Amino acid sequence: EFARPCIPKSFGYSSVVCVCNATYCDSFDPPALGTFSRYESTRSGRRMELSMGPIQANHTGTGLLLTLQPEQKFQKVKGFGGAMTDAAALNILALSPPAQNLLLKSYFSEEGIGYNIIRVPMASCDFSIRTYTYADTPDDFQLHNFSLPEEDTKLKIPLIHRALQLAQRPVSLLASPWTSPTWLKTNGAVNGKGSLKGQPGDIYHQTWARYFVKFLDAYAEHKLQFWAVTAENEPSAGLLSGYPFQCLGFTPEHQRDFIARDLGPTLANSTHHNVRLLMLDDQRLLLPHWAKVVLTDPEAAKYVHGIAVHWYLDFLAPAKATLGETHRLFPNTMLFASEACVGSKFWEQSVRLGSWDRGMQYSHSIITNLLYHVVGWTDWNLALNPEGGPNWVRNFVDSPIIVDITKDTFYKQPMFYHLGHFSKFIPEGSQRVGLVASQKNDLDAVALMHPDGSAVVVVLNRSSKDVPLTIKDPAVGFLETISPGYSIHTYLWHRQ
Numbered sequence: 486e487f488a489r490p491c492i493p494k495s496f497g498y499s500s501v502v503c504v505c506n507a508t509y510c511d512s513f514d515p516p517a518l519g520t521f522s523r524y525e526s527t528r529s530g531r532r533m534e535l536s537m538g539p540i541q542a543n544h545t546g547t548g549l550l551l552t553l554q555p556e557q558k559f560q561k562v563k564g565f566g567g568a569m570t571d572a573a574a575l576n577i578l579a580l581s582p583p584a585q586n587l588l589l590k591s592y593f594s595e596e597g598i599g600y601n602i603i604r605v606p607m608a609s610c611d612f613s614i615r616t617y618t619y620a621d622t623p624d625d626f627q628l629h630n631f632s633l634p635e636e637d638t639k640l641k642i643p644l645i646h647r648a649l650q651l652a653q654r655p656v657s658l659l660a661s662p663w664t665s666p667t668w669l670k671t672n673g674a675v676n677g678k679g680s681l682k683g684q685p686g687d688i689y690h691q692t693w694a695r696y697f698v699k700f701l702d703a704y705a706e707h708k709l710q711f712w713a714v715t716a717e718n719e720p721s722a723g724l725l726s727g728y729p730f731q732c733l734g735f736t737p738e739h740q741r742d743f744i745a746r747d748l749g750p751t752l753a754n755s756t757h758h759n760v761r762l763l764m765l766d767d768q769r770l771l772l773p774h775w776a777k778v779v780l781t782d783p784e785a786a787k788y789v790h791g792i793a794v795h796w797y798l799d800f801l802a803p804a805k806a807t808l809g810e811t812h813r814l815f816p817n818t819m820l821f822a823s824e825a826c827v828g829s830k831f832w833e834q835s836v837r838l839g840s841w842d843r844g845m846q847y848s849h850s851i852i853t854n855l856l857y858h859v860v861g862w863t864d865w866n867l868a869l870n871p872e873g874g875p876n877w878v879r880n881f882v883d884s885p886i887i888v889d890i891t892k893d894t895f896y897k898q899p900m901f902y903h904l905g906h907f908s909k910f911i912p913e914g915s916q917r918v919g920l921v922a923s924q925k926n927d928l929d930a931v932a933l934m935h936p937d938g939s940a941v942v943v944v945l946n947r948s949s950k951d952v953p954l955t956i957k958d959p960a961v962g963f964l965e966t967i968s969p970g971y972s973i974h975t976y977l978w979h980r981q
């Protein structure tokens with residue numbers, strides 16, 4: 486279809502949001518040889534704007550040069566997306582159906598930014614308006630009274646279907662639990678410090694592993710299948726006195742033994758044996774320690790496909806010492822970023838409508854992650870209200886889309902576009918390749934090759950200063966460009 490431009494609105498922060506409603510949302514149209522395409526977003530308000538340029542045979546000058554190394558091959562990309570929490574579903578469904586469609590297309594359509602991953606909580610988390618699990622009848626070890634409530638069957642499931650219908654690209658679903666039923670837990674509550682009762686290999690752990698199969702059976706009854714599940718959301722959280730949100734504590738040895746004795750075998754012996762299992766699903770500072778504990782046990786390692794990480798304590802955890810070292814030790818176990826959002830520290834404003842800085846936090850993380858072997862990157866809530874909710878613990882945060890229910894309006898923030906500079910232009914199966922710089926610079930940049938062999942480079946300028954630069958593709962040519970202060974650019978070219 487015809488592209489329609491951003492309707493910009495300022496709320497007094499560093500950049501604009503794009504305003505969408507029942508009848509209008511910004512969108513894309515559905516390069517020739519020896520030309521490149523450039524998509525640009527800026528603080529000043531350009532939103533993924535297309536231009537084109539020539540690929541040159543020669544280059545001279547002393548300016549910054551970024552040189553592709555297409556023969557230095559790294560990880561293959563799984564993809565990008567966000568989470569269908571109860572809060573995200575409530576927000577989306579509060580819009581009239583045509584506005585809902587435009588919000589879903591923004592994310593999932595080729596006319597939008599081409600998301601291909603949806604994270605699905607297994608029952609309630611803090612972004613739910615009530616606490617529940619799928620098996621709250623006490624001591625139901627048989628799981629006879631396991632069932633999906635309306636949060637799944639009326640809210641999440643129909644919206645996931647609609648997302649799949651709108652997507653051209655195959656979409657992968659990823660499930661994560663926050664808490665077990667409370668009668669499986671040491672403390673008998675959905676939150677707080679508490680783990681499963683007993684020990685791996687016992688009735689409580691066998692029941693909890695069966696619950697994952699029951700979940701997958703129930704979604705399959707609604708014609709949804711999962712790419713992957715994680716072994717627990719933030720297992721370390723349930724180790725902490727008073728922890729306020731739904732949780733279930735595991736030490737790395739506890740997770741090791743649960744996977745080996747219970748969760749791995751139980752999944753492998755089900756119709757769902759092709760579903761991937763990811764471990765950790767927690768802060769990357771826990772690496773490489775947690776990978777060493779779990780993956781040096783061959784009974785556990787045989788069931789673990791990958792390692793999921795969250796971004797929240799990245800300031801404690803340089804990527805080289807965590808992601809880089811884990812890759813060096815366990816190169817065959819993919820690293821995957823499974824949850825991120827801004828606005829979640831006690832001192833931060835939950836929602837800052839139009840924040841350019843929060844957009845840059847997303848793209849800087851994604852590039853840093855890609856440069857250290859990570860195969861994909863998942864946002865948290867797909868949409869929230871202007872308060873950053875709803876959330877039963879009032880742990881409000883920011884989201885790339887903010888829904889204004891009384892106005893049948895939604896706002897696409899800088900975060901949406903910064904994510905889209907990756908999701909739209911890096912399909913599943915793309916491969917990160919080498920890229921080196923001729924001098925020290927303030928840019929974050931990453932190069933990948935599409936399944937068809939074409940090139941994609943994303944460049945984020947972290948500084949206020951415009952930086953002229955050249956991209957060298959060896960034996961193909963040079964791109965002469967400029968990266969404006971604060972901007973993010975994606976470059977694409979066919980290498981034939």
Ligand SMILES: *[C@@H]1O[C@H](CO)[C@@H](O[C@@H]2O[C@H](CO)[C@@H](O[C@@H]3O[C@H](CO)[C@@H](O)[C@H](O)[C@@H]3O)[C@H](O)[C@H]2NC(C)=O)[C@H](O[C@@H]2O[C@@H](C)[C@@H](O)[C@@H](O)[C@@H]2O)[C@H]1NC(C)=O
Nearest residue numbers: 489490491492493504505506507508509510511892893894
């Ligand atoms: C949903 O969002 C769209 C896009 O923002 C709204 O339609 C747009 O309304 C604008 C402002 O009302 C229109 O711009 C105006 O144009 C004239 C010049 O021709 C100027 O005099 C004036 O100052 C504005 O600049 C714009 O044309 C229009 N865009 C499109 C593509 O239709 C829409 O607003 C609703 O519909 C429009 C057509 C008007 O009837 C508005 O009163 C009405 O709010 C948004 N829908 C809702 C319910 O707000």
